[PDB]
Amino acid sequence: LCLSQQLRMKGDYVLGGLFPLGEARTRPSSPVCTRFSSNGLLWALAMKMAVEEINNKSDLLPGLRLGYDLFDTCSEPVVAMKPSLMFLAKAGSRDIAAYCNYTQYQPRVLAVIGPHSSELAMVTGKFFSFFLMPQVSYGASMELLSARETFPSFFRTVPSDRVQLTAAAELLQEFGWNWVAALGSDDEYGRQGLSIFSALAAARGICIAHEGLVPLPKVQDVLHQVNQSSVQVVLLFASVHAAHALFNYSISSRLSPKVWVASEAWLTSDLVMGLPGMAQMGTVLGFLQRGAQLHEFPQYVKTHLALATDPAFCSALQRCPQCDCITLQNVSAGLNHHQTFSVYAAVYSVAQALHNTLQCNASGCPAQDPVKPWQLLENMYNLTFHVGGLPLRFDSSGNVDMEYDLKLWVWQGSVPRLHDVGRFNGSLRTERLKIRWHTSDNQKPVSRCSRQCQEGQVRRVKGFHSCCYDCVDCEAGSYRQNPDDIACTFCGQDEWSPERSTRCFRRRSRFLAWGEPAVLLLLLLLSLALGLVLAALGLFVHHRDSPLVQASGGPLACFGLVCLGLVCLSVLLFPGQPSPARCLAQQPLSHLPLTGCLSTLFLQAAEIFVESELPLSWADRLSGCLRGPWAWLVVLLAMLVEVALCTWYLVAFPPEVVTDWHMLPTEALVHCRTRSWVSFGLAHATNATLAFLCFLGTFLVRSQPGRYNRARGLTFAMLAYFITWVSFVPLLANVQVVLRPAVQMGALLLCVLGILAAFHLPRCYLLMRQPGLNTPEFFL
Amino acid sequence: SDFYLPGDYLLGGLFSLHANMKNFLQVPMCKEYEVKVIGYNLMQAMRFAVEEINNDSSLLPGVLLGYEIVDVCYISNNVQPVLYFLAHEDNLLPIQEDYSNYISRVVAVIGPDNSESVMTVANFLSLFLLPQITYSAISDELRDKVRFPALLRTTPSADHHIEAMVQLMLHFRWNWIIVLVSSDTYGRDNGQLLGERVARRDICIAFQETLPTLQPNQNMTSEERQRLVTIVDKLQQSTARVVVVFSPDLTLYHFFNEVLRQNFTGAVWIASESWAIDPVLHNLTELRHLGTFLGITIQSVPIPGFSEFREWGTCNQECDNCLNATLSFNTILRLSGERVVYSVYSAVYAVAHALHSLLGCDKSTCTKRVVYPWQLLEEIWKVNFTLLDHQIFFDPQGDVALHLEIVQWQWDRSQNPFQSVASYYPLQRQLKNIQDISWHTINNTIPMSMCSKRCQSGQKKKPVGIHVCCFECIDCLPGTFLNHTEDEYECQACPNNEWSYQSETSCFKRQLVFLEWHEAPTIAVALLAALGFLSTLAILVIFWRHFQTPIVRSAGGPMCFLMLTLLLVAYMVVPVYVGPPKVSTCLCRQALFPLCFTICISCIAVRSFQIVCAFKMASRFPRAYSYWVRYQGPYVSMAFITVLKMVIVVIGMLATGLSPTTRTDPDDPKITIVSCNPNYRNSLLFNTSLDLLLSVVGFSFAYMGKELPTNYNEAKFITLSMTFYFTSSVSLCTFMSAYSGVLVTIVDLLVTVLNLLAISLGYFGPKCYMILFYPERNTPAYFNS
């Protein structure tokens, strides 16, 4: 084959070349790579084709021959430094001098087509910059190579990572994803991409939630950190192997789908695209380069391989000792590689710069002294060179410019395909109508942080940097003491705060005020009851000699009426602002006159029971003592035992006026409360026994038709008492705590009204309307 | 000049004499830039080391050691000196496949002071394996020997600097820091390394920010001003008070000036090796109010006889203003000691020792054989000697472990400007010997830089955000505690039915409260039940002592005997109520008490019916009355009521269950009352409902004939007892509906005993009265009336 014999070609101006032709210490010997690489040979053949076409043309470099010295440089820089030193050696000599500056050198090559590897391009460019040798490198992408401070003579024909990262940031901003997580490979490519994207996101308002590095083949902690934050957009600016390892681990761990913004490294790599189960990890949106392709490169490669097979030419006529023993099948897979255009355009740019430098027309090129390599730089900056009908230009920083295509993956039968859904030519323009997202419906995966917090909320700093304020609502009873607080602070426990309030509001007192409608109804009922009691009292004190009052007591009846009126009056002391004395004296003051009246009714019941259901021998002595001074002694004894019990339970059982600070929603309480069922139960034990004895001795009796039934009234009065307080107790145990005193007043008023309407009112009816029934033979 | 000294074996050097602090065709030489003093200091150190090697007859005897020092700029000029060193005496460097035969002009090189230039030089020297012992280059990329075969170091890498920072943070208990880096590769790499290292030591980073690259002696753009204002605002609004800065000293003037302008104080600044020893930043002298300024730097080693030597004194190989610049900074350099000077000293001595071992000299004679650079590299890789009480030996990763030192800035010129407070030993990765540090607090308290306060004893830890060290303290709800041994992130309930108070970390067994014999209300009810049982026993004895009497034959003889025995049984099983509730006690209670009570009440009601309403019913349904008189109607009705109660009570058993229940009372769940029926309210309501349904008809029939003498005024006493029972049941229902607690059992038992006493007394006590004290009313002749 002798293919490697074509790596040199004599010419007036000869170009250099650093290609990855081969692949992989104590003594200082250069390592030797014997493994063959198809991409390097394809690129070398592409540059040879570019040079041969440029020689073929007559309007570019007329009458001048362009050569090339394609030197094999492996990925290691040690094996690549020797070709550079050979390049800078004086032509015809194997020794390179060490002069003070570049102007005294006589390099054997006009320019250099730099290495594909960027890590190698760093060293090669830093070495060539001292000699000001114009090197244009295909495939060198990271941004720092554009620094003119340390690379005054480094150009390139591929866009920097800065433009693609700017496109990605514009995409995230335009789609609204301003809360994204940025990841990069552990090599310098990922780190530089991460730094550039940090700068761009900080400038554009985009936030990085987590900035980790996926290690080259750990990922578990990086994915855990990504999943901890609620992030739905992840920028994976990593090489092929790191991205493949991350996606395989995500296959193993079943990570939730996310929108992966892809770098150009793994966007179009069949390794990641062919991963099993990869379709279950959301959309993948990347920016693929928009560059033309050599429509005639495969034909040239095939015809040159066939011509090299012929021994006649090859005899008519190392760097790549392994390049000779190859066949067409060993290089067929890489004919359609997009870096061939980059190499071709780099060679065309070198030739166009040389043509401009010599300042010649299409007819010919004037004779002059040989042009030094450092003279190309004045015409390499600002170089408009047409490559395949498309004009390209070198920026002031040696960066070529070209458009980008936003390509999103689509899945049909586990076949990922790239659809153009946007264009980036310095200003993003996306067609999001035709984008098919991965969610349940075709809706954009939302990933956004609050740039500012709504007024009345607590702000918590989120993100890697101090990025976004996670607005937090604090539940009622708490307020933001100061804007810089990280948590809402409670009030003084005696004051209420509404939901989402800047400051707290005081708690006022809400007791049973005299203006509430329930108290007004109770007051009207009290007025009616007191009026009825007064009317009955007047009727009983005027007709005092009539048989009615005399048979039904006498002065005792007026005393009981006065007692009921006093109970009605003492009802008035329940509501209002609960002064300690008032709340303390509520019960006994309402319980004493009731005790007296019930004792009078019990005396009448005892008299009736004695006359009814005991033998006359006992009756003649019991009836003559149950009425009069002994009756007065009995009622005074009942009143005095009531007083004794009342003072005993007032000194022992404490009636307290507490303020339940945490019962009502917005207001406080002033609650007058006593022992649970103990206080009023003990106070009413006496009245319960009195009413029970009266009812028991009265409710069965013989009522002769020629007489007056003096027991029905007492029976109905005790029935009203028992029924009204049996109904009262559940009302006390059920009604809201505010209306508890109102329920107590209502119970007392109903008890008094029932006793009156059962005992006194029927008597007054016949005392005032039909006075024909007040005969002593009918009553005594 | 002093840049050259002829000798048998040269020793190239690269020192940064000038720096850039304010067109490619014109190449800017280093002499046009501002003069640095550290470069000349290190150059004088290396010259002194070489002169001491020449003086010493014990080391390299008869072999003069030379050197060739070339001024290397920070970035600009780093290729020409390399080509000068590698070329022959004729400034011609041959190109060949192997360099084993090649003999370079210099035999070793002391590399540049900045990492980028070190990498650039090492990438060139890799072809010939020229030994290159760099100093003050702290990047971690130089640790691997795959791409730097001939690169060695005299300074611990950034790994040990980061480790010292982390150990200093751990000692003072800081777990909430702020990382500030620079846009260059050094700051970014150090920040990434620190973030990777610190995440495994339970210390979190509040936020990471990058300061714009900004050389001094130039005026600032508005965008960078806004950036710095934003950085300072973010720093001030954050709660972290430990700020580490990974940036060269040139770009930190504006940041600190802006910090001073914004009036922000109280940060424990931590400095990397770049600006922890720079004198200008200390000479600013307005940062003393910002807070303590710690830093990481190489331990100073006092070189004997070096200060007097320093004070005694081709292309890019000259400087003129160096002496005048060093004159001003002489006193601060003398006080602060020599830190990087010893690195160059040790590098030169390592080269000399390697050469001595390679020549195999026996302290007197030397073979003077030709020395290839790779042979020297092989030899220096295995040097191990002593130097000023420090051991100089190279690790397999090209590093010699020199002790680090945490230094605190002191604003007092009478002593060392940078006072040392701690020492770090890279060999054991341990930071020890920490002295007192003058803090910026009120009474010299260690600054607190924790993101979350320690949780109070017995409080759940709720994570707040992404950072692990940040959390919120929320009290565990009542009924649970925390097992800090197991897990402090969630409350763990205490089994075996025990409750716990708020913020209580020790559950206590619930005290089982229940009815007991030795109690006041229990003994009161027992006394009442015993009195009733004795009274009923006396009544039964009287009745059996007097049969064949109109009172006992007109009344149901066997009926009353059965009722009396049932009341006896109920009273005797009343004491079963009190005591530890088991299955047997509940079974006996529910199978005995309702049966006896309901059968007694049903007999009462049917007796009242047959003594009052039967006479009236005799008119409407005569054949029904013939049926009733033919059989024993009251007995049939009592049997029907008995089987109905069997059915309903068995249904209640199958519904509400039979196991004793525990009911957490509303007052102090410390206690737990035990009852027989878990649903007691509905069971008591059902029982009282059936009993009252029978009671209404019984009492109504009694009242319908309350005046008929019948069986010695039976109706009146039935009415008396039945109204008593009705009032008792109503009172029990009301108190049940308005109260729920411990007293439920005693109240229910008292109500049951009172009902039994009513049924006994108000239905049999009048009979005892008539039998005993009225011996004339029980004669048979009284039947007619």
Ligand SMILES: *[C@@H]1O[C@H](CO)[C@@H](O)[C@H](O)[C@H]1NC(C)=O
């Ligand atoms: C150059 O032109 C010749 C004819 O003169 C042609 O055969 C050859 O293919 C051309 N070389 C190219 C296109 O590289």
Ligand SMILES: *[C@@H]1O[C@H](CO)[C@@H](O)[C@H](O)[C@H]1NC(C)=O
């Ligand atoms: C290069 O160095 C030489 C030294 O003789 C000097 O004359 C010449 O001007 C320099 N050229 C530059 C700095 O461009």
Ligand SMILES: *[C@@H]1O[C@H](CO)[C@@H](O)[C@H](O)[C@H]1NC(C)=O
């Ligand atoms: C993918 O991950 C699984 C689980 O960790 C592992 O077993 C497997 O080897 C990985 N595959 C590749 C190709 O790395």
Ligand SMILES: *[C@@H]1O[C@H](CO)[C@@H](O)[C@H](O)[C@H]1NC(C)=O
């Ligand atoms: C990710 O985070 C979610 C939400 O907190 C959690 O449910 C899930 O277990 C985490 N891990 C994975 C692998 O999805």
Ligand SMILES: *[C@@H]1O[C@H](CO)[C@@H](O)[C@H](O)[C@H]1NC(C)=O
């Ligand atoms: C050509 O391909 C064959 C088949 O894979 C392989 O054995 C041979 O080594 C290749 N030749 C090279 C790489 O020169």
Ligand SMILES: *[C@@H]1O[C@H](CO)[C@@H](O)[C@H](O)[C@H]1NC(C)=O
């Ligand atoms: C262009 O340059 C050539 C080479 O010197 C010269 O012969 C010719 O006259 C010039 N002009 C044109 C129009 O070709």
Ligand SMILES: *[C@@H]1O[C@H](CO)[C@@H](O)[C@H](O)[C@H]1NC(C)=O
């Ligand atoms: C080259 O750039 C310079 C910058 O001033 C300008 O004079 C010139 O017009 C540019 N040439 C172009 C854009 O073709």
Ligand SMILES: *[C@@H]1O[C@H](CO)[C@@H](O)[C@H](O)[C@H]1NC(C)=O
């Ligand atoms: C970019 O393309 C858009 C249309 O997509 C066009 O309007 C705009 O002018 C272009 N910008 C540049 C700088 O070419």
Ligand SMILES: *[C@@H]1O[C@H](CO)[C@@H](O)[C@H](O)[C@H]1NC(C)=O
């Ligand atoms: C020793 O070195 C010193 C400087 O350290 C120098 O002045 C002196 O000349 C040398 N020789 C002797 C013999 O002291």
Ligand SMILES: *[C@@H]1O[C@H](CO)[C@@H](O)[C@H](O)[C@H]1NC(C)=O
């Ligand atoms: C810019 O530089 C000038 C000249 O050194 C200096 O006087 C001035 O303060 C700087 N700033 C502005 C805002 O002009």
Ligand SMILES: *[C@@H]1O[C@H](CO)[C@@H](O)[C@H](O)[C@H]1NC(C)=O
């Ligand atoms: C303190 O802070 C204020 C507010 O920013 C600032 O104006 C002032 O210069 C600072 N310093 C002093 C000494 O007040």
Ligand SMILES: *[C@@H]1O[C@H](CO)[C@@H](O)[C@H](O)[C@H]1NC(C)=O
């Ligand atoms: C030392 O600090 C002073 C006071 O701020 C300053 O003026 C001077 O430039 C600094 N440096 C010296 C004296 O070298």
Ligand SMILES: *[C@@H]1O[C@H](CO)[C@@H](O)[C@H](O)[C@H]1NC(C)=O
């Ligand atoms: C140092 O400065 C003085 C004046 O202060 C001057 O006379 C002397 O020449 C300078 N020395 C130099 C530039 O080496």
Ligand SMILES: *[C@@H]1O[C@H](CO)[C@@H](O)[C@H](O)[C@H]1NC(C)=O
């Ligand atoms: C260097 O020598 C000392 C003294 O004998 C010894 O302690 C030390 O271990 C040696 N170091 C190595 C790396 O052999």
Ligand SMILES: *[C@@H]1O[C@H](CO)[C@@H](O)[C@H](O)[C@H]1NC(C)=O
């Ligand atoms: C510092 O010392 C004083 C005097 O003993 C003491 O009262 C004070 O509390 C201390 N300062 C603080 C902030 O605790």
Ligand SMILES: *[C@@H]1O[C@H](CO)[C@@H](O)[C@H](O)[C@H]1NC(C)=O
């Ligand atoms: C708490 O943890 C300890 C230690 O693991 C264990 O023995 C114990 O059972 C746990 N529970 C309690 C209630 O102490």
